[PDB]
Symmetry: D2
Subunit: 449 residues, 4 copies
């Protein structure tokens, strides 16, 4: 310690630190404090002007002018944080985004689960055998031994390193022309040709191909077409890591603000959601755009209570409310939440997370999600919006560009016996690359009708 914040925020800051943080690591305090003091001076993962630029883009999503595509790994691992893997995830993210853009007929803003998504809350404190379980590479190792599972503050520094590496690469990839949409559509036509249900989406695939041909015929210069913007996001979970990445930034107008520059967009989880707990108060204090995970037990009245705390100046696009209710309960629970939140005067982004609501333990033993149920939660998410006359702001999916077999269903007909063929996820099951693109086509079809 040494630098104090300005007098408006310092009282609110100490008030925030004092709250109970759930899902935190048990480790040495003096050591973890040193790691935080080190990370207080490093280069941030993002810069304030990019966060301001995102808030303007997310305002367009809230007001109905754009769509939000968020997704990536469930949990990144240091082992998996490689050039081929990041390339593959960036590819599918963009490949989906172009199809989503055609269907929605609006800008698709691309957020990624990347450059920080290491912390993993989904766990019971202690595992079988009386051995503490894996809480993400920022806390401990995947190795099932008391040596590796020991909580290690140094992993915060390892995580920051891997985050800055990852974000460096996505910036590089996007500028160097792997986000050129003529090439992306060429890959999308290779998916449609080689998919078992290929002719079932070939109507829309040829139709996108016509619009891209049409663009070139009208004589447009690939000016904004040659490179795109992939923003980055993770669940703000570790008190130490997120408080270490706090930075001040003087706005170009004149006034200064406080950002958590660990990512562009941070989000609060289902388990860490308490109104008087740390994470909500941390969120309310930082000027980053913010998400909040919302499950079946949400009442309309406390969804408004969140919006009042997290969006205290009614800035459109600031708060994003993320429905993760399961395919059954989304039609039932959501309409009351939208009606009440809309009535209170908050233009939030209504985002669908059809992943963390539909997770079940299969007959095989492996944890899985069935594709058809994932799609159905989004199907019902749109139905709620169409019927209420509000704007479906975005999706939030967990995927990988690798040819893995973690979710059931899809075009390739992934059964229970296919699951141990290739399974690489650090926690939740993710959409196979085919299933990622297939989802995009169906969500595009939902955006049309």
């Amino acid at each position: 310690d040494l630098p104090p914040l300005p007098e408006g925020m310092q009282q609110q800051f100490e008030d925030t630190i004092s709250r109970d943080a759930k899902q935190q690591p048990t480790w040495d305090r003096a050591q973890a404090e040193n790691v935080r003091k080190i990370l207080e001076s490093v280069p941030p993962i993002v810069v304030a002007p990019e966060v301001l630029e995102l808030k303007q883009k997310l305002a367009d999503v809230a007001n109905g002018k754009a769509f939000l595509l968020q997704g990536g790994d469930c949990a990144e691992t240091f082992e998996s944080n490689t050039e081929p893997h990041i390339r593959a995830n960036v590819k599918t993210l963009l490949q989906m985004a172009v199809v989503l853009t055609y269907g929605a007929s609006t800008p698709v803003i691309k957020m990624a689960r990347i450059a920080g998504q290491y912390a993993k809350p989904r766990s019971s404190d202690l595992d079988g055998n009386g051995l503490p379980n894996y809480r993400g590479d920022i806390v401990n190792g995947v190795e099932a031994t008391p040596e590796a599972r020991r909580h290690d503050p140094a992993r915060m520094i390892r995580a920051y390193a891997n985050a800055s590496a990852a974000m460096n690469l996505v910036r590089a990839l996007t500028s160097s022309g792997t986000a050129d949409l003529y090439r992306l559509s060429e890959w999308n036509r290779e998916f449609v040709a080689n998919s078992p249900a290929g002719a079932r989406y070939e109507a829309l695939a040829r139709e996108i191909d016509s619009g891209l041909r049409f663009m070139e015929a009208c004589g447009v210069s690939d000016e904004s077409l040659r490179a795109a913007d992939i923003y980055c996001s993770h669940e703000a979970l570790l008190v130490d890591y997120e408080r270490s990445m706090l930075r001040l930034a003087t706005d170009e107008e004149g006034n200064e603000e406080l950002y958590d520059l660990s990512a562009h967009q941070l989000w609060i989880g289902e388990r860490t959601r308490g109104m008087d707990d740390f994470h909500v108060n941390f969120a309310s204090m930082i000027s980053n755009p913010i998400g909040i995970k919302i499950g079946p037990g949400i009442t309309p009245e406390e969804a408004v209570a969140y919006a009042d705390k997290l969006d205290p100046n009614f800035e459109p696009g600031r708060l994003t409310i993320v429905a993760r209710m399961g395919h059954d309960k989304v039609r039932s629970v959501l309409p009351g939440v939208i009606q009440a939140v809309e009535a209170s005067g908050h233009k939030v982004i209504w985002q669908s997370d059809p992943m963390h609501g539909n997770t079940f333990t299969a007959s095989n033993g492996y944890k899985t999600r069935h594709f058809d149920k994932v799609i159905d939660e989004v199907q019902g998410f749109f139905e709620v919006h169409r019927a209420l006359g509000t704007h479906p702001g975005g999706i939030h999916i967990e995927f990988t560009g690798e040819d893995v077999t973690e979710c059931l269903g899809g075009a390739e007909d992934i059964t229970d016996v296919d699951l141990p063929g290739r399974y690489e996820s650090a926690c939740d099951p993710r959409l196979n690359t085919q299933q990622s693109l297939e989802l995009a086509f169906l969500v595009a079809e939902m955006l049309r009708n």
Copy 2:
């Protein structure tokens, strides 16, 4: 007289003047010579750099990279050469061009029957009552009296005036934003909504609407989208008018060339087509891009003979061969012509004129064309190209943006009793504005499959 041309061309020029010109006016020579000497010094209707730019664009059409949309009034009249009329024709030309662009998936180059299309050859020398018939406003008046029907050299000057007025307006209209394609599509959706066979083209209309939305979502600046290029063309027919508009122009590289700057593109007619007559030799000598009307009696061997004379340096896009064979004879006659011309080493533009081949005298008395037969000649024109593996370069139609009833058929079901309701053409019957747009949709559908 006073200026002689350079020694290469002067021998070829005098050789050209010496040939027989068919379809010429009977009038005073000394007087018509004065009119020509006056028009030798006026501003031209176009400038050489625009003609060079067209030859590059027409080369793309010949090599398969673009499409050619040519059309307008059959014969312009001084009475009809007005702001609302020219606007309407420019509108439909552009409205068609955008649909044709989507279907073809290539640039549609827009040529118009405008700014010079006054001469009209379709006539028997003398009419009933022993009274000379209307040969176009550049020769005599529409008024059915020996006073007005007298051949008047001064009408060449009147024609040049009206031409320069018309081309001034189309330039103005195109630059001032009546060629903004977002507005054009908004008019195309008003056509599809209000047409009796509206839902029969609404598949493609919504699909074009999606591509335009998609363009805006991808974040393209309306840079080349806000204004387009409409070129101008007429049938080079009057020796005096066309020889008066001859101009030299030093190319930016260094060498000089000889253009007939009465229009961008000139074309030779069916009646004026003799290999040793004036018009073909005039054409061969001028550096303008050139068309040539081709009917059923064409043999493959003399189509090659034309191409050798008119395109002596195998410049792709220079000659355009225009099939006007009738809906029956186009499948039969055309394949032999394409095979032979392609074999000889000439990349010409294969253009379809489904108008001047399908003209019949109706039971009413009025001269008409049936829509279905016009479409069918184009249908068969593409079939010949699809089967032979050559590129269908363009269409050549006669239309008007006015709500007139001159052709039978179409969506609105124009019968013989509808014909005297509104009939405004100086010679041939033209496509109703609905029929013009309807044709575009069907020719677009032919360009896809």
Copy 3:
């Protein structure tokens, strides 16, 4: 007659026609009425959207964001209305405009004395020998005989024809790439190299050359650089010609307006300036942007009276006040006019006409202007603005791209004995092409300091 205007304007229209028009032709009424009825239906020289676009650009000039370059022939002639002559005038206009743009560091909006500047008021009713003098090619011929000098209504139609020809060409020239500023600067460096006072402007010429190199080095696409906008203007003088070119136009918002579409910008002359005469009331009624010539006898109070009549809604850039006071009287008279007009709440364009104030009969007999005096009126025009803290809006000069010798002075040292070497003007003496470019450099230097 047949069409009546809407009830707001019709009372004001008949009120306007009823006023005395000065400087009008003596000719047959029934005949001149026929000519007007003919011209009521022709294509206009410009279209309303271009006039609206100009009013927006002229608003930027009034508010200090841009400069106005107006100029061309003093009087166009049908004999002089040719491709080489129009090209030369368009060239110098643009060549000046690029230098003026660098000096002013703002957009130079290009207006031209073209496509209508045929009427010429500067004359005594009857000439020597009791023979009526030349009042411009729209009224009578230059030929010094009672045959040609007879006033001929038909010349209005001849004038419209020549106007539409001229404007067609300038549109063509500007779009076809003779307004590409890399080529224009290459011509400007040929002027500076070959001028006798070449090294006296070579500081600024190299400095403009550096900025153009710099533009290309920064990697700018010649998008708005390849083609420019030359607008057209003349003195609204003939009642018949100007009232015949009146057109209505529905604004894109909804409301309709009344334009004189003979040109983009019309202007009122010194002789035709009466507050209750025709021309001021005609001007006030038409939605075109308007100029008004102002000489030494102007009092500040009646300059405000004009502004209230001509700019009744305080639309910036609508009225342009044109100082033509002579090199001596401009410092004296102008400051009071600016102070009063600015105080009244009118953002007009303060334009300098250093031509029609400094015209004297030389010792040779020929009417001439001395270059140094022309420059000095502009020098003093800026001094008045610099001292008062107002914006010098533009210049208004009479020039020709031909190598003529009409004004004295300049770099080439044009004496009285040089004047009969080559003299081609229909009325006032014009700046030699060197003198035009030289003026631009000096006015640029005045715009800097």
Copy 4:
């Protein structure tokens, strides 16, 4: 170990490893091998398409169409690798680049000493007291103790982390609009206003300000103006670190190549320059663009021998030869080197390093460089090129955006007693931020004449 390279390169690779590397660290082999195996799988600092794009840009520099601005810290430190410091260096790099662009009248390609410049060769093996000296943060610590000075393989991983952090930030900064040249010029005018020799460069500063105003007046869209490309470079020195960052990359055409993706451009030093030593053979094998430091003892014949080895296919821009000869010896030695290298058929980039040739120990005790001598080596570098008629390709300077006092001279008159006021460099003395910008202005002035 596990992956072998393709059979063309593997023989050349093992041949390269076998050579003597000078200036290497003494540390544990098995441990340093582990660090290398770890870094073999991480994300690279750059991607092959950016390196290809640089080689195209560096080809333009070699052929005379562009200039190369290389520079930054002499040695980066982990302590100094912060957001404010990197921002400051990026700022001055860009601020110089815009002035250099105006003077050169060509694209300035921006390379930086960043994201890897940690190794430092300038040292005697052992220091005073029998204690090993600082060889850069990638090898050991600055702390003057045997604990910190111990050679630590782990610092390679620390270095990679800090490199990926730095490059992430420069990418972020450049895209987020701190490379908008209107803002950069506003900072350049604040330098010129506040510099003691302010009016001595105010001629050029106003002249650049005029060109930027002119750009905006001509109506250019800030498309390529809003963001720029800063590439990254360091001295390829540590065998382990550089061999660990080797990656293969399939070219978009088809063929594959081998890059050291630790940076975009790598360069060989004066001490590590042996023709049969590791670094030259490593360089020759990698497809990165390559530099080579050249001092007074260079003979023309061995400069050709380098060029034949490093540029074996005469690819223009591939090799960059960097003259670091001192202000006296550059005029003498360089001309023979250029003549011979040019004669052999190699279009290399002739770059000037006026820093590492002019380093002397001052009377104070501190190591310094005098500004005037630095400038003079560049002055003579251009003189050699002007006289020989070859292209001066670029500069290579050591600077910092911090207000430090390390070099003598400049506008602020830095004497020996000023040196201990603020001195922050890990090795060589760097240009003060004023001295950096001042140098740019003078090198710009040299590029003009």
